[PDB]
């Protein structure tokens, strides 16, 4: 049912994580993180944040494109490993999906599960707000306050990105 | 804060985002604004040792609004009971609950 | 604590367990750090968007800004490791003994 | 030209927002009755479903305070059909 | 619903075209036909060998600048605030620091590809 | 004034893109501090009614608050209709 | 490295730490650590040799993992309290992650394996920052969240640190590895008194910094990084060996030296809270520290190890090292016990 | 704890205003000029009472006044109004810009046959004052009694008795 | 305290600088032609490429 779209996207979100957490060739690990970024954008986008969902997808699409170039230069071998070529990779991949299956199986059967925290399986739609906003997007108004309210945040992040460029040149200088 | 430069200098560096009942753009309220305000006003100036026991009612309502644990349990029981009655043909849903 | 929070918190645990169990490639571990940041971004965005905490809506963006700095910093170190040994294997990083 | 037309666009926006501001009292009044009607219908139906449960008290509040708490989506559409629940939850986000 | 159905149709059409491509034509597969292409002579080594990136430093810098678009894209909404003096100050400060980063890397020969 | 003109001509002959960049950016920082219309941008943003104007309970001692929308009291947008 | 760039990166390290101390919002605290790690690593890579690359990489991997756990704690604390204030956390699971994240940053046992290796792989000046300045930010956070810290977790880490630090320091001949294991052991004393009196955590941190900064300054003066290299100091700078003796005896907690004060005050607070078995165990286990400080005095000041002929050439040149604040630090690290009641200024 | 009190379905019964969104937007400016007092009364009740159950009676007078408003349009301006809101209804954004000629015909009918003057720009966004006999709520949040503050410490600050009293120290 | 595990440990270099590893630069060899538009048909240009 489409009422569980958020839950169905979060299952793919975990499956993508098991994709790169099992650590095959970073080429295939990068693909797994793109799938998680794509569905993660979908999950966030269904809670009312379209800018946040599209932005994280946009940032991670460029992030894994640099990682792809770095994988062909410094993280490549003759036979890049897939989720089936190695027992250690395959073992961790099957284990991740089985735990995902059991958690999904129990939450949809009992409507509850207790692991550190107590989770509810009624559906994500039961916690949404029943009132409408006005003529604006609340997420957009909060993000636009960074420049009027977040003067201190803009300075530290701005300085951090500046020093970030200085640092990477220093680290990679080699002399 | 370990060093309270903000309070002495009179500069607000990060206090404006610490609570969700503070001033927001366009006076947009948070869903648990009333509950947070009550817990903050109950436990003002009395220390966390006292507030942990004397403002326990407000803080439990505030946590109920935040995570809705007790409401979802209540909905679960009603929904579970309705299925049991329907599964054994003992309850007819009304029209406005079906269409 | 809806059923979505379970999967998001499980994603963080998977990426954490993935980061703490190295295979060979330093690049494979760097992906797990970027995976963990993604989980924290999603989990924070969900909580903030659901509670209508308007001003907190910028926090997830500020979380991505400093995730890139770390990711760029981790890549810069990976260049120098590769230039010294010809691979990004972590078993070569053992000249220093505890 | 661009700044002259954008200036006119701001005045057309204020007019549009004032049209909403004229209707909000009527819309708010309707919404209050609609929300209260739905809650009562769930209360009249919780009584029949939960008549046999031993310790159940129909309409009990989960909060200590007697203040009005805005119902969340589950409380308001707890027992209604999935078709109307789907539009009340994702109707706006999905309308493109 | 509409967006999801639009995506399903686009990738279903793409998939069906690929399926037809592999099942409609007559195939004659043999070893030499599917060998890797290197202009007529056998490749000397594996294509999976390391491939040096001479613009690695510029690629790292792309990660940092690609995060400025996330911070800069809210500007159209930021201009709607009542605190224009503060908003315009931090908008220009943020863009200027982005420019100083470019100036530093440019002057320090950071944008030049390694030999 | 002679040696400085040499610098400008030299850059204008070798980095015309950068000369245009710095000139454009300099105007962005300077003109707003001088334009008389900058104050109206603040007023237009403040005059846009996103929220509902919640009425004030009338205690009988608020002469500057209108009782009806079309009363003379209260802020006026006559300036905006001519700006 | 350009001197201006070194100064800017140095100030960025301080700014990150200062942001953590003045921040009242959790997000800013996290930003402080991220800024601090961003600036520290280039100072570790300054000499650009394979050991420095390994040290920086091991340091980055550990610190990056800790910052992820700290952000998880902040978000979990946000879900259960709906506020970002830097105070006691409102969820037990958030406290454990934050406590462990702060333990990894400090290098407490059993998260200590990087401290001996990172310190060995970087120069002495970079090591001094690693073992003195990097401890201010994590200790700032523990000082503010201690009411919610699980008592068993924090005391367990403290006890393991005192044990591992003492044992690890016995099998070492490298000064940077000796100072590294000494640091781990001293972290235990700071965090052991944390649940009972956070003021004494500040006292031990201040005294530990002064003594630690004094040892590195004296090792930096002679460019000594090994026990045997330090064994030639008596034949070049005899005065420097006496100062090393007094400081090392102070670090061992022997009265009437300054370093006895933090142990003495920490035992007082724990015994007031009816904690008797732990202070006794901590004091006795600290004798492991005093043993491999005594072993350094023996080969440095109390005996005269063999010299080499070329040493005679070093007699004709003075010490051109800056040795900033060394005369002041050595005095504060040895003669401060009569001023012990001045610990009240920290309150 | 406690039972949530809800009105009966008879308390929520009222004659609805069954007109589409294009009808409301076409008449919004005149509607907000004529029905201000019952509107602002109800809107003050919601923000002061913070409870929809405490403003049902005011919420009915909003409906009653809106009906009388449209009945007057239905008696004098029936045809010009229909053309106006038909043209607003055509646009996806319900823009005012595209119906000025039809708006003028609607504005002149009410001006002559009813004396209604359209509010100027910025009028309906004004914060106004409303007279009401309804008492001001005293505890709208249903707050409990705030805990008593810690006994404040005040007085003259004398020197520490016998100094620090730290072990053997005399000062 | 020597043990069997630490029998092959040796003290680090006096200046923290380990010898650089034996040159293992792996240039990429590519056939540029003969069947190549820019090879003029019958040129087999074997090129060692770094990037
Ligand atoms: C006096 C009161 C005593 C009170 C006692 C209480 C305890 C406090 C005292 C602690 C003792 C600290 C000093 C230790 C000795 C320093 C070592 C030394 O001799 O220098 C050699 C050594 C360099 O020798 P080298 O390795 O051969 O060459 C390095 C380069 O390769 C060379 O490359 P180059 O040739 O291009 O040159 C680079 C350039 C570089 O120049 C500098 O070194 C300047 C560094 C910036 C310091 C600026 C002063 C701080 C205040 C500035 C105001 C803004 C601060 C906020 C910034 C954010 C706001 C924007 O020049 C230098 O290197 C100058 C030589 C170093 C002199 C350092 C003098 C300042 C240290 C004392 C002040 C502490 C500063 C905070 C520590 C920084 C942490 C990262 O110095 C260092 O690199 C170490 C720096 C110090 C790190 C340890 C500092 C202690 C950390 C604990 C905090 C203590 C305070 C809080 C707790 C206690 C109070 C309650
Ligand atoms: C506000 C109240 C602050 C009270 C302290 C005022 C004096 C501090 C500034 C003097 C200074 O340059 O030392 C900073 C510092 C001294 O480091 P140093 O190289 O180890 O000093 C010994 C040299 O041989 C120094 O020899 P030099 O030939 O290179 O220079 C002679 C120096 C001689 O200056 C001195 O007397 C050095 C000793 C003064 C600093 C003592 C540390 C601060 C005292 C408080 C710490 C003890 C706490 C109290 C005891 C424990 C609790 C009761 O006289 C001056 O430079 C006059 C500067 C006037 C400005 O120089 C810097 O690099 C930072 C600037
Ligand atoms: C869902 C999967 C979509 C992607 C399918 C891509 C694809 O079809 O490639 C053919 C690939 C490539 O296979 P192949 O290259 O070995 O040869 C394909 C044709 N044969 C086997 C006859 C020589 O094969 C498949 O995986 C086909 C999967 C079955 C698709 C349905 C077939 C219906 C035919 C009518
Ligand atoms: C519950 C969590 C544990 C689930 C089981 C996960 C183990 C799955 C099997 C596996 O990972 O491989 C077994 C591993 C040896 O694998 P392998 O990489 O082939 O070692 C020799 C390579 N030259 O050997 C192991 O280390 C398995 C340890 C368990
Ligand atoms: C099967 C896994 C399992 O059940 O282990 C649970 C174990 C005990 O924890 P707990 O559930 O609180 O105690 C019993 C209460 N019925 O707790 C565990 O061992 C679970 C291991 C969790 C590892 C957490 C690593 C740090 C990340 C913490 C974030 C929160 C993650 C927990 C929620 C995800 C659940 C899938
Ligand atoms: C309830 C909530 C549950 C939350 C936890 C979910 C975790 C599910 C598993 C998905 C995450 C996968 C972790 C990554 C595992 C890994 O990378 O293994 C690396 C390690 C190195 O192996 P290798 O270098 O290839 O040499 C062969 C040695 N056998 O390979 C190995 O040594 C053996 C690999 C075994 C992989 C099984 C990991 C599951 C147990 C982890 C602890 C669970 C907590
Ligand atoms: C505005 C900042 C003005 C500074 C220059 C910014 C543009 C970068 C120019 C770099 C190239 C240059 O011409 O200057 C080089 C400068 C001088 O050093 P020099 O020895 O003469 O030559 C370089 C040797 N490698 O070498 C240097 O030391 C560069 C030092 C600057 C490094 C970048 C940091 C800029 C300072 C921040 C400016 C913005 C203010 C931020 C405030 C927020 C603080 C929280
Ligand atoms: C109030 C807030 C606004 C102010 C913000 C403060 C920051 C301003 C700077 C932000 C932009 C960062 C870049 C600034 C440095 C300029 C780039 C640079 O570093 O040039 C160094 C240049 C290196 O080139 P080189 O290899 O030496 O060969 C040419 C030699 N002539 O060596 C050189 O020869 C350069 C010679 C000096 C160049 C001066 C450039 C000044 C730029 C600012 C001018 C703005 C005003 C102009 C517009 C007026 C209004 C129309
Ligand atoms: C590649 C990109 C860069 C291209 C070069 C940039 C352009 C050259 C720089 C000077 C011009 C900048 C301003 C841009 C044009 C402004 C708009 C315009 O020209 O229209 C004139 C307009 C007329 O008034 P208006 O009220 O709009 O009348 C119709 C209203 N219905 O006027 C207005 O409405 C607004 C009046 C304010 C105009 C702003 C400029 C005045 C700034 C204060 C004086 C300082 C001038 C600079 C001198 C100091 C710097 C050297
Ligand atoms: C590699 C794969 C990892 C494991 C994934 C889980 C597979 C087993 C699921 C069994 C649970 C069950 O019986 O539930 C089945 C549900 C069906 O959806 P629902 O919305 O809950 O409909 C049921 C509730 N009704 C009747 C109210 C509508 O399935 C899921 O939603 C699983 C997530 C989608 C699969 C991933 C894409």
PDB file of N, CA and C and ligand atoms in Angstrom, chain G residues 322-329 331-332 335-336 339 342, ligand 2:
ATOM      1  N   UNK G 322      63.728  28.396  21.498  1.00  0.00           N
ATOM      2  CA  UNK G 322      63.007  29.440  22.218  1.00  0.00           C
ATOM      3  C   UNK G 322      62.738  29.039  23.663  1.00  0.00           C
ATOM      4  N   UNK G 323      62.327  27.791  23.892  1.00  0.00           N
ATOM      5  CA  UNK G 323      62.017  27.302  25.234  1.00  0.00           C
ATOM      6  C   UNK G 323      61.098  28.277  25.965  1.00  0.00           C
ATOM      7  N   UNK G 324      59.968  28.584  25.337  1.00  0.00           N
ATOM      8  CA  UNK G 324      59.086  29.623  25.853  1.00  0.00           C
ATOM      9  C   UNK G 324      58.422  29.168  27.145  1.00  0.00           C
ATOM     10  N   UNK G 325      58.476  30.024  28.163  1.00  0.00           N
ATOM     11  CA  UNK G 325      57.849  29.819  29.465  1.00  0.00           C
ATOM     12  C   UNK G 325      58.456  28.668  30.252  1.00  0.00           C
ATOM     13  N   UNK G 326      59.570  28.096  29.800  1.00  0.00           N
ATOM     14  CA  UNK G 326      60.151  26.969  30.526  1.00  0.00           C
ATOM     15  C   UNK G 326      60.564  27.345  31.942  1.00  0.00           C
ATOM     16  N   UNK G 327      61.252  28.464  32.186  1.00  0.00           N
ATOM     17  CA  UNK G 327      61.585  28.808  33.578  1.00  0.00           C
ATOM     18  C   UNK G 327      60.363  28.984  34.461  1.00  0.00           C
ATOM     19  N   UNK G 328      59.269  29.518  33.916  1.00  0.00           N
ATOM     20  CA  UNK G 328      58.051  29.668  34.704  1.00  0.00           C
ATOM     21  C   UNK G 328      57.344  28.333  34.899  1.00  0.00           C
ATOM     22  N   UNK G 329      57.254  27.524  33.843  1.00  0.00           N
ATOM     23  CA  UNK G 329      56.527  26.262  33.942  1.00  0.00           C
ATOM     24  C   UNK G 329      57.202  25.300  34.910  1.00  0.00           C
ATOM     25  N   UNK G 331      58.958  25.902  37.518  1.00  0.00           N
ATOM     26  CA  UNK G 331      58.710  26.309  38.897  1.00  0.00           C
ATOM     27  C   UNK G 331      57.280  25.978  39.308  1.00  0.00           C
ATOM     28  N   UNK G 332      56.308  26.254  38.437  1.00  0.00           N
ATOM     29  CA  UNK G 332      54.921  25.935  38.760  1.00  0.00           C
ATOM     30  C   UNK G 332      54.695  24.435  38.847  1.00  0.00           C
ATOM     31  N   UNK G 335      57.010  23.635  42.668  1.00  0.00           N
ATOM     32  CA  UNK G 335      56.766  24.315  43.941  1.00  0.00           C
ATOM     33  C   UNK G 335      55.427  25.036  43.857  1.00  0.00           C
ATOM     34  N   UNK G 336      54.353  24.294  44.105  1.00  0.00           N
ATOM     35  CA  UNK G 336      53.030  24.885  44.237  1.00  0.00           C
ATOM     36  C   UNK G 336      52.215  24.269  45.362  1.00  0.00           C
ATOM     37  N   UNK G 339      50.643  26.512  47.936  1.00  0.00           N
ATOM     38  CA  UNK G 339      49.540  27.313  47.421  1.00  0.00           C
ATOM     39  C   UNK G 339      48.329  26.463  47.045  1.00  0.00           C
ATOM     40  N   UNK G 342      44.606  27.589  46.717  1.00  0.00           N
ATOM     41  CA  UNK G 342      44.269  28.403  45.558  1.00  0.00           C
ATOM     42  C   UNK G 342      43.441  27.644  44.531  1.00  0.00           C
TER      43      UNK G 342
HETATM   44  C1  LIG J   2      48.717  42.058  32.957  1.00  0.00           C
HETATM   45  C2  LIG J   2      49.726  41.446  33.925  1.00  0.00           C
HETATM   46  C3  LIG J   2      50.622  40.464  33.175  1.00  0.00           C
HETATM   47  C4  LIG J   2      51.885  40.191  33.987  1.00  0.00           C
HETATM   48  C5  LIG J   2      52.984  39.676  33.061  1.00  0.00           C
HETATM   49  C6  LIG J   2      53.647  40.846  32.334  1.00  0.00           C
HETATM   50  C7  LIG J   2      54.982  40.393  31.749  1.00  0.00           C
HETATM   51  C8  LIG J   2      54.735  39.409  30.607  1.00  0.00           C
HETATM   52  C9  LIG J   2      55.336  39.950  29.313  1.00  0.00           C
HETATM   53  C10 LIG J   2      56.855  39.816  29.352  1.00  0.00           C
HETATM   54  C11 LIG J   2      57.298  38.830  28.273  1.00  0.00           C
HETATM   55  O1  LIG J   2      57.742  39.228  27.250  1.00  0.00           O
HETATM   56  O2  LIG J   2      57.176  37.457  28.496  1.00  0.00           O
HETATM   57  C12 LIG J   2      56.261  36.821  27.652  1.00  0.00           C
HETATM   58  C13 LIG J   2      56.941  35.625  26.991  1.00  0.00           C
HETATM   59  C14 LIG J   2      58.095  35.167  27.878  1.00  0.00           C
HETATM   60  O3  LIG J   2      58.540  33.907  27.471  1.00  0.00           O
HETATM   61  P1  LIG J   2      60.114  33.523  27.754  1.00  0.00           P
HETATM   62  O4  LIG J   2      60.883  33.589  26.459  1.00  0.00           O
HETATM   63  O5  LIG J   2      60.200  32.129  28.320  1.00  0.00           O
HETATM   64  O6  LIG J   2      60.737  34.596  28.837  1.00  0.00           O
HETATM   65  C15 LIG J   2      62.074  34.464  29.215  1.00  0.00           C
HETATM   66  C16 LIG J   2      62.963  35.222  28.234  1.00  0.00           C
HETATM   67  O7  LIG J   2      64.302  34.900  28.484  1.00  0.00           O
HETATM   68  C17 LIG J   2      62.771  36.724  28.415  1.00  0.00           C
HETATM   69  O8  LIG J   2      63.996  37.364  28.198  1.00  0.00           O
HETATM   70  P2  LIG J   2      64.127  38.432  26.951  1.00  0.00           P
HETATM   71  O9  LIG J   2      65.528  38.983  26.902  1.00  0.00           O
HETATM   72  O10 LIG J   2      63.822  37.737  25.650  1.00  0.00           O
HETATM   73  O11 LIG J   2      63.063  39.664  27.184  1.00  0.00           O
HETATM   74  C18 LIG J   2      63.092  40.326  28.413  1.00  0.00           C
HETATM   75  C19 LIG J   2      61.681  40.380  28.991  1.00  0.00           C
HETATM   76  C20 LIG J   2      61.665  39.721  30.369  1.00  0.00           C
HETATM   77  O12 LIG J   2      60.349  39.429  30.735  1.00  0.00           O
HETATM   78  C21 LIG J   2      60.244  38.506  31.778  1.00  0.00           C
HETATM   79  O13 LIG J   2      60.462  38.842  32.891  1.00  0.00           O
HETATM   80  C22 LIG J   2      59.844  37.064  31.491  1.00  0.00           C
HETATM   81  C23 LIG J   2      58.947  36.554  32.616  1.00  0.00           C
HETATM   82  C24 LIG J   2      57.617  37.297  32.596  1.00  0.00           C
HETATM   83  C25 LIG J   2      56.487  36.305  32.342  1.00  0.00           C
HETATM   84  C26 LIG J   2      56.260  35.460  33.588  1.00  0.00           C
HETATM   85  C27 LIG J   2      55.011  34.608  33.391  1.00  0.00           C
HETATM   86  C28 LIG J   2      53.769  35.406  33.772  1.00  0.00           C
HETATM   87  C29 LIG J   2      53.676  35.523  35.291  1.00  0.00           C
HETATM   88  C30 LIG J   2      52.369  34.913  35.780  1.00  0.00           C
HETATM   89  C31 LIG J   2      52.531  33.400  35.865  1.00  0.00           C
HETATM   90  C32 LIG J   2      52.798  33.000  37.314  1.00  0.00           C
HETATM   91  C33 LIG J   2      51.464  32.862  38.040  1.00  0.00           C
HETATM   92  C34 LIG J   2      51.625  33.231  39.510  1.00  0.00           C
HETATM   93  C35 LIG J   2      52.341  32.117  40.271  1.00  0.00           C
HETATM   94  C36 LIG J   2      51.443  30.893  40.465  1.00  0.00           C
HETATM   95  C37 LIG J   2      50.146  31.227  41.200  1.00  0.00           C
HETATM   96  C38 LIG J   2      50.417  32.116  42.409  1.00  0.00           C
HETATM   97  O14 LIG J   2      61.295  41.718  29.110  1.00  0.00           O
HETATM   98  C39 LIG J   2      60.412  42.188  28.131  1.00  0.00           C
HETATM   99  O15 LIG J   2      60.361  41.676  27.068  1.00  0.00           O
HETATM  100  C40 LIG J   2      59.519  43.385  28.439  1.00  0.00           C
HETATM  101  C41 LIG J   2      58.225  43.289  27.640  1.00  0.00           C
HETATM  102  C42 LIG J   2      57.252  44.353  28.137  1.00  0.00           C
HETATM  103  C43 LIG J   2      55.923  44.220  27.400  1.00  0.00           C
HETATM  104  O16 LIG J   2      57.424  36.008  25.736  1.00  0.00           O
HETATM  105  C44 LIG J   2      56.622  35.625  24.653  1.00  0.00           C
HETATM  106  O17 LIG J   2      57.109  35.046  23.741  1.00  0.00           O
HETATM  107  C45 LIG J   2      55.130  35.952  24.626  1.00  0.00           C
HETATM  108  C46 LIG J   2      54.935  37.443  24.352  1.00  0.00           C
END
